[PDB]
Amino acid sequence: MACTIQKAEALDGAHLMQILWYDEEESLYPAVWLRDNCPCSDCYLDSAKARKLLVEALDVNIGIKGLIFDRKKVYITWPDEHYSEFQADWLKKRCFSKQARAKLQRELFFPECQYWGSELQLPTLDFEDVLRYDEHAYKWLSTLKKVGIVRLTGASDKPGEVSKLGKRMGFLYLTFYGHTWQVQDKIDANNVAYTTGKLSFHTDYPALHHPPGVQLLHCIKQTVTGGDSEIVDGFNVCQKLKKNNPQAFQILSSTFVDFTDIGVDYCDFSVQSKHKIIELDDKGQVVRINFNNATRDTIFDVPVERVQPFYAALKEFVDLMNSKESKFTFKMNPGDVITFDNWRLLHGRRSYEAGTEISRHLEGAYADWDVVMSRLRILRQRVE
Amino acid sequence: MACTIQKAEALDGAHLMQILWYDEEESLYPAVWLRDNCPCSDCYLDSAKARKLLVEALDVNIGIKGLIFDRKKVYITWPDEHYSEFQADWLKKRCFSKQARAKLQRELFFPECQYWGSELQLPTLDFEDVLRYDEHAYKWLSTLKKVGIVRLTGASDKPGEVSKLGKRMGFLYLTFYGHTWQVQDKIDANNVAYTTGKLSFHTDYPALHHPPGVQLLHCIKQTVTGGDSEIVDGFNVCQKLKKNNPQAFQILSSTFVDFTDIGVDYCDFSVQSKHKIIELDDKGQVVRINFNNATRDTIFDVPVERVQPFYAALKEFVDLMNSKESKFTFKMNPGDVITFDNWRLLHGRRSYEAGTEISRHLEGAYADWDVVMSRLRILRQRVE
């Protein structure tokens, strides 16, 4: 009844098609959009699922010349004698009502989000299960997207596990630190990560204009002397900051901060960026946190009078992150893997003791959110 | 005289340091910024060129407790007995005046830009020279950044040339179409690029939220039956559009368009995005064009009444691109490589004739702008 056509007609000087469905609801489709999206082999390459029609071939003032229909299809003639057929279900799905458009966007982008503080129950799955079963890989990625983190247990205590998950997603994201990389204490460390020092809350790689969306960290070896992990939900903290201190929020979401990274690892590099620490979309929703205090530059491109207020804002923001209501602490063991949203979470670690042998070793990697979402879309379809 | 210290003092309740240089100019440095950027081994890890100091250790209300100086350094004591030394040249470079900050930004980001239309003289270098000499690789990347395109001649007529340039930059950008990819006519083409059809002006990969910054295309084999290349400077076209049709400009720079790509190539994929076709920074400057008509989705997430005005805007934009004053046409020969800014240029190709053997073959690859700029920074330093 809902996707069965009861009536189709051209309206509004034939610039619009209206469908009355059998459930009595109505949908409207501009004529230019219909012509633009003609599925015939002239206009549309089915093997690629892509449009061949050029913008240059589209009359933006086009009207429908003729229309007939049955319960399942509309058949249209155009002023220049082009001919088009559209299927009822295809039409129904693309209805321009706010409700139909929003529903489809949810299905494409999995916007569901569950904010958390210290009460977090760390979502946890088995590693081999995730590699083997789509049902488990689906739960893995959907929870990663919704909650921002998933732990995987039962991996080995050897290099190569993040690489297997990378393949399960599709491919990992290559950076100047390599395809994968080793978090251990190193002589002449090119990065504070590669020391025994404390890492306060940070996102990885704000020195890139497109920081890694997803981070993977696998504990190969762990020390008893320290090295606990800490996470906080950045979207949650930002919401509390806007509430408690709209001025601090305003400064952090509007000020461009310079980040830097110079050194040699996979290649030799001299990397520079600018980002707003709290990054808002066009509707004012926080979509990314860009913040690592180690790689924030000495160069600070703001007028002198904006400097101290910036720091006072940043301090309020860091204090919220450290608050006992926001922060969640745990300690990784050999064979544990954490996979998390590096645009949303900030993470850190406690200091631990140097010695003459390596007491602590994680292997990490990155992946692009688009690569991950693509796998998520495919998995959902296979599972449903 | 300009970077020699004539006087240093604490001012403004000791919250500011003022330096009077020997050229009689003055610079101001907030106390909190100085403490934040103390270069001592407690605060700063020299092997990483990174800050160890935590935000949590920074008193945002800090003042200078004592200060002494000579011609080349300032020596500061802090209220908690921490001690800091700063070098005159380091200080001079980071001066918070608008002029000093802007100068340094130019040096970091190479903003110089030369807009062009049909009068373009295609910048051209030798391929092997670029692989061999830093002077030539520097000219290559600086011109790529400034002009948006460089041709390289004298490559071979065999696969693997884009890969060599990838290494010269650092590394190539892996996508679902592979590390490198073959533009040829293919049975069951997963993409309109892999046909003999005309490609109108487009950027590559707006189906990703972070489209490739730089594209490389190497002609292995060329057909006489068609297949000429066309380019246009997108930043130039946008400027003309804002002038001629501010309404069209407003629609294109504000409307989110959905892009899609579903198929199998390097991996199986189902990719979705949203972008504004004309993408503006926070000051209203165009920083990216995101537009491929083949991969623009059938799904169009706007209210019905915005649809036709969107198309009328897009048509004005495409017509400008096609104008004889904007467009530059040329034809690639075996051994030619084009490297260009895929955020700024749009490119296309003329149709050509199918046959039973492959008459036309290019190999392409992508690179990230951050990877390229890093190499650019390193090269400049080596050459100067």
Ligand SMILES: C[C@H](CCC(=O)O)[N+](C)(C)C
């Ligand atoms: C880049 C990260 C550290 C975070 C950063 O520098 O932003 N590595 C662990 C070294 C791979």
Ligand SMILES: C[C@H](CCC(=O)O)[N+](C)(C)C
């Ligand atoms: C992605 C490009 C075409 C452009 C596009 O689909 O956006 N390939 C040539 C197939 C690698």
Ligand SMILES: O=C(O)CNC(=O)C(=O)O
């Ligand atoms: O060592 C850890 O526990 C966490 N490591 C990092 O956050 C890093 O390397 O960037």
Ligand SMILES: O=C(O)CNC(=O)C(=O)O
């Ligand atoms: O075939 C050409 O000349 C140009 N190719 C493309 O723009 C492409 O593959 O995306």
Ligand SMILES: NCCCCCCN
């Ligand atoms: N069942 C209706 C088919 C209509 C074909 C029209 C071709 N011009």
Ligand SMILES: NCCCCCCN
């Ligand atoms: N040449 C001046 C060195 C000052 C050292 C001060 C240590 N507190």
Ligand SMILES: [Zn+2]
């Ligand atoms: Zn139906």
Ligand SMILES: [Zn+2]
């Ligand atoms: Zn058609």
Ligand SMILES: [Zn+2]
């Ligand atoms: Zn980290």
Ligand SMILES: [Zn+2]
């Ligand atoms: Zn290298």
Ligand SMILES: [Zn+2]
């Ligand atoms: Zn000097």
Ligand SMILES: [Zn+2]
């Ligand atoms: Zn110090």
Ligand SMILES: [Zn+2]
């Ligand atoms: Zn292309």
Ligand SMILES: [Zn+2]
């Ligand atoms: Zn794969």
